Amino acid sequence: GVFEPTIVKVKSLKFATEAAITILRIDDLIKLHPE
Amino acid sequence: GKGAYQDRDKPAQIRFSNISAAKAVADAIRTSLGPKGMDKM
Amino acid sequence: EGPLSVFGDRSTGETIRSQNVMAAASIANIVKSSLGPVGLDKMLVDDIGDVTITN
Ligand SMILES: Nc1ncnc2c1ncn2[C@@H]1O[C@H](COP(=O)(O)OP(=O)(O)O)[C@@H](O)[C@H]1O
Ligand SMILES: Nc1ncnc2c1ncn2[C@@H]1O[C@H](COP(=O)(O)OP(=O)(O)O)[C@@H](O)[C@H]1O
16 A cells, blocks of 8 residues: 655656756866955 | 167066966866867856 | 966866765765655754754
8 A cells, every 4th residue: 555646756757867967067166265 | 680689578478478378268168168068167 | 276367266077076976975865864664853953942853
């Protein structure tokens, strides 16, 4: 009797992949000093 | 002929300081160019 | 550094790729003990003393 809605696992796949892409494409950080 | 002595070194050292400043900016954004260039944050 | 006076700092290459991941893996390590039917809760205390218990 262990069940879960299918929209939970479908959405979590799409959100976890798009967030990994945007972090992966970064090859430089410039941090500006506060004023 | 050996005339036209150049007794001031300020224009020479300034023209060379503009080259190194501009060449350094072009080297910074060389990586992000083309279909396989990455992103800066 | 030398050239490129930006009045900041910069990191390029494998220094920033292996630092963006130790920062992501630490956040996931906080909530890794609160998963499934055998997971426990947590306690959060602020500077004034407001206690919040959640998982
Ligand atoms: N699929 C591709 N294969 C090879 N070269 C490409 C491709 N797409 C774009 N380019 C080339 O990359 C060059 C630079 O593009 P890009 O760095 O993305 O933006 P920008 O044109 O603003 O520099 C362009 O002159 C273009 O001819
Ligand atoms: N009775 C159970 N037996 C086995 N696995 C379970 C049971 N209840 C929940 N789970 C699993 O625990 C996982 C995590 O759920 P939970 O720890 O409650 O937090 P969240 O629901 O936010 O992920 C789910 O993927 C689910 O499959």
